Design a protein around this ligand. Structure first.
Ligand code: HEM
Length: 394
C-alpha cells in the first residue's frame, strides 16, 4: 500500500509521475490517501473510461462496506451517490434546468457578474490581487446561489465549509462543517416553504411538499446540497488552475491573445491539462471485480484517477504539453456515463466568460507568484490552488 501522505506537497504539486508509475504496473492499486483513507486507484484512460460507465461499480453506499457518519448520512440522498432507478429520477427532476439551451439564457447575467468582479479587481491600488479571491471563487458561488436562492450575505460561509472539506486540518473539522451546512440548508429549505420564491430551491421544496413520492424530504436536502456544492467547488478550481496553466505558458497565452477564436478550445485544454477533478467520486464494486488480473473486493472504495487518464499518451500525444489547439474530444474532465456532470454546460459558460474577460480587459495580466510559492491540495480527488496571486502592470 502506497502512502500518498508520505509524498507530501511534492505529490500534491505534481501527482502525475506517481499516477504514471502505477499505470505502468497495473490498472488498479491500493493506496493510502493523505487524509488517511485506504482506497483503490484505477488509472489509464481506457480503464478509467470503462469503469466510470461500468454498472458493476455502484455509487450507492448500500453497496459500500464503509460506514456513513451521521452528518454524511443526512446529505447522502443525492443523484451522484445513487444508481438507477433512483439516479434516473433525481436527475430528470432538474435536468431541464441545466441543459445548454437553458444555461445559454444565463449568459447576460453571468457576463454582468464577471464584469462587476473584474471591475472591482482592476481597481486594486497596486495593480495586484489574488485571482482566487477576486474572481475564481466569487463567480461560481454567485451563479449557483442565485439559481438556488441562497441569500448573498450567507455565501461566504460555503467557502469556509469547502476548506473544511477539501483540506481539513482534522477529520472532525470536515464533519462539523457538514453538520453546520446540513443545518443551514434545512433552515433555508424551511424559510422557502410557504413563500412564493421563483428560485429552483423553492420549486424543489414545493415539489417535495406536494408529492413526497417524486422527492422525499431527505432527497430534498440531498438535492440542495449536491447542486450547491458540486455547483461551484470544481468551477472555482477550473478557473484558477486554467488561468495558471495559461499564464505559465507564454506561447499559449500569446497564441490565444492573437486569435481569441481559440478561446473555447483553450478552456477544453485547461480541463484536459489541469482539470479540477483529479479523481472521480467514490465507486463501490457490487461484487468482486477483476481488472487485468487485479481483484478489487466488493464494497471497497474505488477512485478513477481522471488526472491520469488525461496524461495517457495513447489518447493525448505529448500529454505533458499544454496545447490550446490540441484535440481534446472525449476527455473525462466531466466524467463519463450516467453521472456525466449535469453542470458541464454551465461550467463551460462560466469559465469561457471569465477567461475571455481577463484577457480582453487585462492585456498585461501576469502571474505574481512563483511555482514553488503555490499551494496545491494533497487530496487525490481535488486538483486546486489555495491562492493565485496575479498582477497587471509591467
Ligand atoms: C468546471 C467544473 C466542473 C467539473 C470539471 C465537474 C466535474 C464533474 C464530474 C467529473 C462529475 C462526475 C463524477 C463521478 O462520476 O464520480 C460531476 C458530477 C456532477 N456535477 Fe459537476 N463539474 C463541474 C461543474 C459543475 C457545476 C457548475 C454544477 C452545477 C449544476 C455541477 C453539478 C454536478 C452534479 C449535480 C453532478 C452529479 C451528476 C449525476 O450524478 O448525474 N458540476 N461533475
Amino acid at each position: 500500500v502506497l502512502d500518498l501522505g508520505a509524498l507530501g506537497q511534492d505529490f500534491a504539486a505534481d501527482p502525475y509521475p506517481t499516477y504514471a508509475r502505477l499505470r505502468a504496473e497495473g490498472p488498479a492499486h491500493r493506496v493510502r490517501t493523505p487524509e488517511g483513507d485506504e482506497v483503490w486507484l484505477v488509472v489509464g484512460y481506457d480503464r478509467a473510461r470503462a469503469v466510470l460507465a461500468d454498472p458493476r461499480f455502484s455509487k450507492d453506499w448500500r453497496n459500500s462496506t464503509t460506514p456513513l457518519t451521521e452528518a454524511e448520512a443526512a446529505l447522502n440522498h443525492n443523484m451522484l451517490e445513487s444508481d438507477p432507478p433512483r439516479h434516473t429520477r433525481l436527475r430528470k427532476l432538474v435536468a431541464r434546468e441545466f441543459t445548454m439551451r437553458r444555461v445559454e439564457l444565463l449568459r447576460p447575467r453571468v457576463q454582468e457578474i464577471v464584469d462587476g468582479l473584474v471591475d472591482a479587481m482592476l481597481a486594486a491600488p497596486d495593480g495586484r490581487a489574488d485571482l482566487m479571491e477576486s474572481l475564481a471563487w466569487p463567480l461560481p458561488i454567485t451563479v449557483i446561489s442565485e439559481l438556488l436562492g441562497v441569500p448573498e450575505p450567507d455565501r461566504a460561509a460555503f467557502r469556509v465549509w469547502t476548506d473544511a472539506f477539501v483540506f481539513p486540518d482534522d477529520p472532525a473539522q470536515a464533519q462539523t462543517a457538514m453538520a453546520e451546512m446540513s443545518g443551514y440548508l434545512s433552515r433555508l429549505i424551511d424559510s422557502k416553504r410557504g413563500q412564493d420564491g421563483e428560485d429552483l430551491l423553492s420549486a424543489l421544496v414545493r415539489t417535495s411538499d406536494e408529492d413526497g413520492s417524486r422527492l422525499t424530504s431527505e432527497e430534498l436536502l440531498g438535492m440542495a446540497h449536491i447542486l450547491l456544492v458540486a455547483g461551484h467547488e470544481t468551477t472555482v478550481n477550473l478557473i484558477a488552475n486554467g488561468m495558471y496553466a495559461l499564464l505559465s505558458h507564454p506561447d499559449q497565452l500569446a497564441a490565444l491573445r492573437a486569435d481569441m477564436t481559440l478561446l473555447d478550445g483553450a478552456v477544453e485544454e485547461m480541463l484536459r491539462y489541469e482539470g479540477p477533478v483529479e479523481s472521480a467520486t467514490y465507486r463501490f464494486p457490487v461484487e468482486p471485480v477483476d481488472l487485468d488480473g487485479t481483484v478489487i473486493p466488493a464494497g471497497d472504495t474505488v477512485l478513477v484517477v481522471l488526472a491520469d487518464a488525461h496524461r495517457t499518451p495513447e489518447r493525448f500525444p505529448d500529454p505533458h504539453r499544454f496545447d490550446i489547439r490540441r484535440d481534446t474530444a472525449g476527455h473525462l474532465a466531466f466524467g463519463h456515463g450516467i453521472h456525466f456532470c449535469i453542470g458541464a454546460p454551465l461550467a463551460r459558460l462560466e469559465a469561457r466568460i471569465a477567461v475571455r474577460a481577463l484577457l480582453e480587459r487585462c492585456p498585461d495580466l501576469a502571474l505574481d507568484v512563483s511555482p514553488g510559492e503555490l499551494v496545491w491540495y494533497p487530496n487525490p480527488m481535488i486538483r486546486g490552488l489555495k491562492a493565485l496571486p496575479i498582477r497587471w502592470r509591467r
